């Protein structure tokens, strides 16, 4: 439905939707922009990610509420409604994965863009894994493979303080702890990421230092919760 709107207008409307907290509209505008077929800039990649993170985040929060109610009850209404929300969540994840596969990842040559999209791929397979059962194994391996490829590129091409590299390592650690039942892998990754970033902070400007230390704080918070 966005095929008749100019790319630049879709991006401008995504920025307005963000200010208006209209995240479903924001995601639709950014999907339209991606479907124009041009690569996305750093700012545009962040708009895409913010839009879908907010949409799927609301769905995940709703699914967790309904799943909790359903687990305590063990009529069909709670199960039926949890299934409805689950199907909608899976549809949003499939949409994002489809944009990544057709054709954002294959056209991303720079490390910053390729790592960003591969991290997103890991994240949306992770959200699928949160609701999957038994099928679950295959989704988990898809998330792991995307995160691992992103990690390999990021370690070769980015400094340890780069915010994309840090956010990737953070989310992969969450994958290990919450999805893959590998809490020791999660703790090891978070600790090594934190320590390597700490030792690189001296190279950063005041602004970059703030960016990197904010994400490092999340690594430390998880380590506190996990140990």
């Amino acid at each position: 439905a966005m095929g008749s709107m100019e790319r630049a207008s879709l991006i401008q409307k995504a920025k307005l939707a963000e200010q208006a907290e209209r995240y479903e509209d924001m995601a639709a505008f950014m999907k339209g922009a991606v479907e124009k077929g041009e690569e996305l800039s750093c700012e545009e990649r962040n708009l895409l990610s913010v839009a879908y993170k907010n949409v799927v985040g609301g769905q995940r929060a709703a699914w967790r509420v309904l799943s909790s109610i359903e687990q305590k009850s063990n009529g069909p209404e709670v199960r039926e409604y949890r299934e409805k929300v689950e199907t909608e969540l899976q549809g949003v994840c499939d949409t994002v994965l489809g944009l990544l596969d057709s054709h954002l990842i294959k056209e991303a040559g720079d490390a910053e863009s390729r790592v960003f999209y591969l991290k997103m791929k890991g994240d949306y397979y992770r959200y699928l894994a949160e609701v999957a059962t038994g099928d679950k194994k295959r989704i988990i391996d898809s998330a792991r493979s995307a995160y691992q490829e992103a990690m390999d590129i990021s370690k070769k091409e980015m400094p340890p303080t780069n915010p994309i590299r840090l956010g990737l390592a953070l989310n992969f650690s969450v994958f290990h702890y919450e999805i893959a039942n590998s809490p020791e892998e999660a703790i090891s990754l978070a600790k090594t990421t934190f320590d390597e970033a700490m030792a690189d902070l001296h190279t950063l400007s005041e602004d970059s230092y703030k960016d990197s230390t904010l994400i490092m704080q999340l690594l430390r918070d998880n380590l506190t919760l996990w140990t």
Partner: peptide, 8 residues
Amino acid sequence: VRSLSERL
């Protein structure tokens, strides 16, 4: 409590 993932 659940683990914290990357924030916007």
